[PDB]
Amino acid sequence: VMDHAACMVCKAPATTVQHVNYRRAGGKEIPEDLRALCRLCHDACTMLEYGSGMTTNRIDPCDPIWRERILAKRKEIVEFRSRGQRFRKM
Amino acid sequence: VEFKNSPISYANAFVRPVSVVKESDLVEQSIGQLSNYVNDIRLGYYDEQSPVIG
Amino acid sequence: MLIEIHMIQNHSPANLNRDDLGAPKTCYFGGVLRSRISSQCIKRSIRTSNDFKALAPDIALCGRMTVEAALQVAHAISTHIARPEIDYFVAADDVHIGESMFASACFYKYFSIDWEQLVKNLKGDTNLAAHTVGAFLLAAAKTNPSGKQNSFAAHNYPDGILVEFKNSPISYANAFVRPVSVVKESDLVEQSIGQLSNYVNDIRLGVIGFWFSPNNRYPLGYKHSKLASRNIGNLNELVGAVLDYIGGFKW
Amino acid sequence: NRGTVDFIASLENLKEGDLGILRKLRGARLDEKLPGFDLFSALWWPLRQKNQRAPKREVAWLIAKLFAEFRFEQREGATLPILMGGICRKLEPKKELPRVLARFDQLASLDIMQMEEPLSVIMGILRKHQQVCLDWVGLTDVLSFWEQEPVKREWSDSFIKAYKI
Amino acid sequence: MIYLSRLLIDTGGNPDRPRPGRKWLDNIYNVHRRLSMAFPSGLRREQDPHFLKPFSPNDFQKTPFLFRVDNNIDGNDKRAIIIVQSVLEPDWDYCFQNALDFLAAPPETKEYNPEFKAGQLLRFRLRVNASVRRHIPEMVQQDGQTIETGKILHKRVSLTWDASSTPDQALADWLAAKSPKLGFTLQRCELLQLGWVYGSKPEPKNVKVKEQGQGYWREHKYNPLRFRAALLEGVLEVDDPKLFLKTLSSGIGKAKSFGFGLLSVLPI
RNA sequence: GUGAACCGGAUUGCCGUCAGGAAAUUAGGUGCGCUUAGCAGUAUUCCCCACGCUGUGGG
Ligand SMILES: [Mg+2]
């Protein structure tokens, strides 16, 4: 509701949520560790965190230093992804 | 290189093992952890009557 | 009133104190063997050193031949299982194989200061008693035994001090009944300080305390608990806080 | 533990093409290749939605790689430090036993990111010594807590007890 | 002055790949909003030049712009065209600085100072909102039997013709009934493409009072938006100067905030 | 204020010279994704303000 259902990087509507940090889990969740992004941005920042080992603090889409990496990853995702593999889940 | 009046060893920067991640190499992370410990000790046990440089 | 100092420090591979057979000194605790540095090592380690020499001082604090010394030092104890090793060395002729041995451990120490006996031994002096207390604080925070230090240059610096003003003398050695197992998401020092945290969080549920950590590296307690009264970032500031809690006292 | 069992069942529900695609991605991370990431996501993420104790991304990816390479049958009671130990007896005590023992005890100095090739050669010597059964669930549950001493403490203990028989 | 712009969208190629620009066009609220952030606040463009902050409606200037979307341009490639008319200078480098994959060509802008004389032959293209507000009784349920309730609804429905007249004749009558007030007269008007437009829109709704207070917890609820569209092309002649300019950059029909009035004029 | 009070097991040390895991192996044999579908000639278009008993203006 707060983000007006708009992505934080590319401004397309928002469907998922990424966690900026994991200080509190499960029982307590202040809505300042959460940002609204769409599917391509979620997958891009998910693949940016496969082997990082940063544990607590995750990627902030507001910070400009990650934007050029994220857009190149999104260009890779648009270049390479097969939709028909995502559907028909094998 | 450094100059003291009392011997201070900085071996405890590596009590946590260094795990190689996809971005950096072993050398840069080793000297980064060493820099973190050096910064923390410099901002910790520090007396104005005998300041140090290096 | 008793001023009690809690002390956690890590140490590099060396051998500070040894017995007649040469072995690193070792006590028994918690069902297993513990690395040990003698209290009669920290005495004559801090004592007669150059940094500490800064009514006569160093007699009321530590005695010599009914002196009634007002400082008590306990035996340092590791927070994990002792893991000794033996090194093989050979000699040259430059024109036979021996064995030396060493041990590495993180030790918890404990310091207690009687204020009333210190004031009584100062013939009514009070600024001198607090002066000697501060002097012992700066000495003890920056003193190591002079063991096999030329070959094993062990010159490590501490990683946390908590100071207490409790009514009766009580140590926290029972916090290390369970030996510390190292997990991937932590280290030895963090888990040791956490085991110290989940023994001061108790007792009160089942006094005050000043805490210091260098540039606030490993904060006491893994929540926002008030288990320590104040968390400080300098050794001089912690000493000034101790003097301030004793009374109006400037360093 | 639940969530593991459905993960191993979904691994066994795979077909030829999926096993080949995870086979070609051996020795790599996931973020480089997109079909592998998508297949792993479609096979793993609903379980993580439903169950909280579903396997981590790295351990699940590694176990998927090993299952795609070796394709052992799932059967309870065929865990790794038992078949190691039942195998070690048939070798010469002077030469081959320390050779196999060193490769087996090298695992206590490696991380989950570094534990693909030693596991590859250990299941290789299984496949060479004509074995078809292996407890994958037990291996996943011990790998998920591989960084604890009692887990590798009961590792070689199961070994010693199988070897002494 | 009047500012016109053009945006080009591929809308084609391999269907198996993600196409965010192709996906953006399925909702008219999203299209209108995406054109709507093209005008920041003098303060906003100094605050976040990277456009990497939460989007709020109040930090952007308000201007009643008009737009239309067209398709079917060949040349061995497919294209989708958005034409935006506005009274302020658009900032296309700020709206799409993180959305370059939407468009197959960089945006363009140009000035427009249309000066005309009375009685001039002009070619126009317009998509009109065919809507009439009517009195409707209330039908409910329809669970195999119709239940009537006495409430009469004042609602906006589509224009309806009879069974004996063509849609083009009735649309032309509906446009010539209005052309004397705008300042133009028809000679020919034919129907090209008639249809419906769907849209969906976030609307906040209260759920639960905060335990700490100071507001609610809220949840997004989505409301349908249906309109009738009929695309028309023809030739008109001017009847008044400041009146034809009163017709332009103001709108002819309704629903102008969702791209339902735009006159594209060519002197034939 | 205790078989207690005072109380360093300390100094010396290169494991350094010597080594091919090597010879030889087809993963080949068989399979239709098939029967279906106007983005339009309509009879309610989700909400709001204003004026009359349908025409403007905003989402
Ligand atoms: Mg996005």
From TrEMBL, chain A:
Residues reported in the UniProt entry to bind Mg(2+) 3: 10, 41
Amino-acid positions noted as binding Mg(2+) 2 in the UniProt annotation, renumbered to this chain: 10, 38, 41
Residues binding Zn(2+): 10, 38, 41
Amino acids binding Mg(2+) 1: 10, 38
Name of the protein in its database record: CRISPR system Cascade subunit CasD
Organism (species): Candidatus Cloacimonetes bacterium ADurb.Bin088
Upper lineage: Bacteria, Pseudomonadati, Candidatus Cloacimonadota
Automatic annotation (TrEMBL), chain B:
Entire-sequence positions represented here: 271 to 324 of 378
Gene for this chain: casC
Species whose genome carries this gene: Candidatus Cloacimonetes bacterium ADurb.Bin088
Protein name: CRISPR system Cascade subunit CasC
From TrEMBL, chain C:
Protein name: CRISPR system Cascade subunit CasC
High-level lineage: Bacteria, Pseudomonadati, Candidatus Cloacimonadota
Automatic annotation (TrEMBL), chain E:
Keywords, sorted A to Z: Hydrolase
Origin: domain of life: Bacteria
Enzyme class: hydrolase
Enzyme Commission number: 3.1.-.-
Record bears the keyword Hydrolase: yes
Protein's UniProt name: CRISPR-associated endoribonuclease Cse3
Source organism: Candidatus Cloacimonetes bacterium ADurb.Bin088
Originating gene: cse3
